């Protein structure tokens, strides 16, 4: 079997055991994928929370505003999967704003210097990784990022909003260079996961209406439905979709109520 | 392995081995589901084309019109299924509107009548498979339908885009009730593919624009498509289909996923 | 002065006065449009409703459902205007749809009659409609139907959705076969309105608010797009919501 | 009436008469409103421009990348109309992106420098212009951004594309701030129009395409040429008459938008 039989996949995003990534990785190598994972910060303690994945994998350093980081990652990546060996797949599960960007802070009140790192993290460095990636890629293959619905405003998520229109619109983009490697390029837009990342009755009211909204209902606390419909799009089975989003959501974008 | 291993599931809309329904069928085979097929009106034509697939399914008739048909559905499924037994999963991949309400014929004067039945066909007759087909659904099942991306106008197709705008928003409905067994719904736009559907539109349009514009409609797909769009090709449809019908997308329902290339996300 | 001053403009769907198409009819005559009327059933009643309006206005039989009306409204409506008169707008306000497609009937068991009946009504007739005026319309000219929101599944509104999400589709095919004419067609998206026909938290999630009693806003945006001020929008959608379509909360 | 009369409405963005802000300024002034001019760069040239507008209006300094320029503005634009009075309207009409992010130059080797700089000049400004001028805007008001529908990516509009996409999100933002002022917000998506930044973005080729392919799927027609459409869309949304809608996008691109083909 294995849905992922055979593939190799890159899985960035990983900082805790409650990370989307981490849940990512962990089906995907149920499903028979052989991973190489990257780490921003802490690599240390990744490295103690990558040994709890059902199997091992190469971790390297990445840190997405870095331009060494980004020149020598193509080449790290074949030295960790045996040279004359591409990857099958990439996922981008990597995100950031300034508090300022953020919560309770007035939308006006954030200053661009902040805007701007948020928009290089979030949005911007999901070109400069599949700029990264692409060369080593393989046909058929395909680029995954992730993505919180931004088409109407809501209380909160402010300037992060904003960066996952911009991430939106870089998708597009990059499904028409991908394109030309044989590679599909898309978003999973997820509900809300109880994640390191996400952390009064504003959040609360906005959080609940997922459930809600939901004809099959939603979990904050189970990342395993975003994971699995972000393998599906690593697979063989969603051959023809690209510069897409795909909802793993319980369906709530759909319904107003 | 078999991505759909296991599962029983309804596949309508056969009616010629290069249907989309016939391709979605025969990978839903391959990937180790058990079948049952439904097909309209040239019953001794379809089942000589469903001994084609890999694997026997049988084979009932669904008027999706016939009040009749659709009230006996759900028992003449579980007969051939075995009692106990229920469907993990159902495709709806039939579509119709009169001439009238296509081609070079004017927007303006199909007859309601004409607009109605296609309408009947094409986007109500969803809800009414769900309704019939829902009550031998296991929870975690699946219904899929075919639409053809209606956001946009286009030459020729016409009121058939207004039947998949309706189509559009009965899933999202037929979304609400199926959530209530553990069910999806959604539905798989479609790029354009070589099924006979277009063929009688086509022809009458030979000599005049819009058998042009078909055409340029046609062809601006693969060069719209980031990765390339083929026409002749179904099986990254069937495939898409069969995505959806497996546990592999447990998160989506009342939603619509584009099988097309990427077409629909690009300005050319 | 007087946005509309000039125009000549054909309004459907009054039958109180508290329907959305009287205050457009209000609205159009302040700005000095002049108007000719349709009504579908209890035309003495209607007529009755109209004369409340600022002006006179003809007010002529038109059930978008009876072909043999339709066949003779442009012919009609020349007279009510007079020799080398045009058409400058037209103004669609009229829907339906049975009980069994709305409300607390389970979405199932709307009979296809029922659903087709809604459909002929709320959205086909948006075409017969244009097919029929656009004949007698000036360049420059534009047709307004009225729409809700039909891009998400809520409750309560069941087969009426689909309806408009099949009128959003007619619009744009209408917009194709108006502009050969030079004409415009659009929707005006409303937020709920306390009509007729009937109609808590749109005041919630509009950033300036939403009076479900004040058909008045409506009435305007309506009236904006048959003025010139708008000369470059069809096949389109206005959003008449207070800006509630583009909040989730 | 003067479909403006009486209002008095900023509009930034003139560079040259065939600028965007030129026309709606133009209109805006033949529909009787007063006006308040800004402008970038070459403000001495800018004058010369708007010395050929129906009337004469003041003309303000504002870079928008200018923090100064920014926490002076209302200051400045109150001086310009005289104590006591607010402004009724304000027109974004403002863009940038540098070359490598912005034609034939590969999307993947646009520097983040350069897209930060058009990101902070096409959608950041947007926010940064509303927080500078609604405490001096009258209830009632409209705020005004232009758009160039980004929703499908394309060849050339490239990372000016994400700015725009950007710049919606912004929109809809500006409007949760806008809305406890009694204000509006809203973008105008134009079709294109032949401005100093259309050149650009080989040139004269891709242009007559460009204004056949637009004309060809707008069911009314497009003329490059002309940007009077558009500034009357501007007007009004700056109008009374669209009272009821923020957040929001109003497509002025002959409905192009609206067919596949
Ligand atoms: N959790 C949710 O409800 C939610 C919903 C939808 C989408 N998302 C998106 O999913 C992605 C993962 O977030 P999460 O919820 O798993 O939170 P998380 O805390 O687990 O992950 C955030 C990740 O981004 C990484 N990161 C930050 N700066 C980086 C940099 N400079 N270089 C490389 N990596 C960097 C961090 O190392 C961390 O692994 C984000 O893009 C987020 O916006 C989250
Ligand atoms: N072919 C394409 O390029 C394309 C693209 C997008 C979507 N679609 C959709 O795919 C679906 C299948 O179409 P296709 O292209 O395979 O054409 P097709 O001719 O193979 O399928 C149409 C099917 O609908 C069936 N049908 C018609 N009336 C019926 C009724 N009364 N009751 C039961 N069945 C009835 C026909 O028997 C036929 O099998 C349709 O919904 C169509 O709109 C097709
Ligand atoms: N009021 C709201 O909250 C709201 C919101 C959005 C859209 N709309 C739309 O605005 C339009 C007007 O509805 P309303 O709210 O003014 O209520 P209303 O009851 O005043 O309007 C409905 C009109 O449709 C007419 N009608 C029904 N069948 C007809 C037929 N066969 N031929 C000709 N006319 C026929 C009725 O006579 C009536 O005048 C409808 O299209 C409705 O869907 C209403
Ligand atoms: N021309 C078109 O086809 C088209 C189509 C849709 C939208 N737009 C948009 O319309 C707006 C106006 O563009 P245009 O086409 O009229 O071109 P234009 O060159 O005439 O005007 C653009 C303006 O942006 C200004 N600008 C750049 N950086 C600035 C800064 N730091 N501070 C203040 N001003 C600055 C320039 O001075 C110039 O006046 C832009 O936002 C553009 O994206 C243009
Ligand atoms: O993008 C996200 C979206 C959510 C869902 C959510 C949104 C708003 C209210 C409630 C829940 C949760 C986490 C998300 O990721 C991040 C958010 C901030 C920062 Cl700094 C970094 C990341 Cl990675
Ligand atoms: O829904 C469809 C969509 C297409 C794609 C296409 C559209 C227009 C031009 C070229 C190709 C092709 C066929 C489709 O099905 C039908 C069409 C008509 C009838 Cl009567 C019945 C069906 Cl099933
Ligand atoms: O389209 C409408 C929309 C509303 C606003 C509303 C929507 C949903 C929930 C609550 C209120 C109100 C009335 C509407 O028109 C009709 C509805 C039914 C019938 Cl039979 C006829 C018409 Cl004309
Ligand atoms: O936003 C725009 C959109 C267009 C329409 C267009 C798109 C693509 C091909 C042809 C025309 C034209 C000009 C636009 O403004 C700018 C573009 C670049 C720069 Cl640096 C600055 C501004 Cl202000």
Redesign the pocket.
């Known amino acids: 079997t294995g849905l992922l039989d055979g593939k190799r996949i890159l899985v960035?995003?990983?900082?805790?055991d409650?990370?989307?990534?981490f849940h990512i990785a962990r089906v995907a190598q149920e499903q028979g994928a052989q991973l190489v994972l990257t780490?921003?910060?802490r690599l240390r303690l990744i490295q103690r929370i990558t040994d709890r994945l059902p199997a091992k994998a190469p971790l390297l350093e990445?840190?997405?505003?870095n331009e060494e980081h980004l020149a020598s990652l193509a080449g790290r990546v074949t030295e960790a999967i045996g040279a004359g060996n591409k990857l099958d797949g990439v996922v981008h599960?990597?995100?950031?704003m300034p508090q300022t960007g953020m919560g309770i802070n007035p939308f006006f009140d954030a200053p661009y210097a902040d805007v701007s790192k948020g928009i290089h993290?979030?949005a911007y460095?999901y070109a400069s990784m599949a700029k990264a990636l692409l060369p080593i890629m393989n046909p058929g293959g395909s680029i995954v990022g992730?993505?919180?619905d931004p088409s109407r405003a809501m209380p909160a998520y402010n300037w992060?909003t904003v960066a996952k229109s911009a991430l939106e619109s870089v998708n597009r983009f990059v499904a028409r260079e991908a394109g030309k490697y044989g590679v599909r390029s898309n978003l999973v837009?997820?509900?809300?996961?109880r994640?390191?990342?996400?952390s009064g009755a504003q959040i609360q009211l906005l959080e609940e209406g997922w459930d809600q909204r939901a004809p099959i209902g939603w979990n904050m606390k189970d990342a395993t439905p975003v994971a699995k419909t972000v393998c599906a799009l690593l697979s063989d089975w969603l051959p023809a979709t690209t510069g897409d989003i795909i909802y793993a959501d319980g369906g709530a974008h759909t319904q107003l109520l």
């Open positions: 960035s995003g990983i900082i805790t409650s990370s989307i990534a780490g921003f910060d990445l840190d997405v505003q599960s990597i995100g950031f993290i979030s460095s992730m993505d919180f992060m837009a997820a509900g809300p996961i994640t390191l990342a996400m």
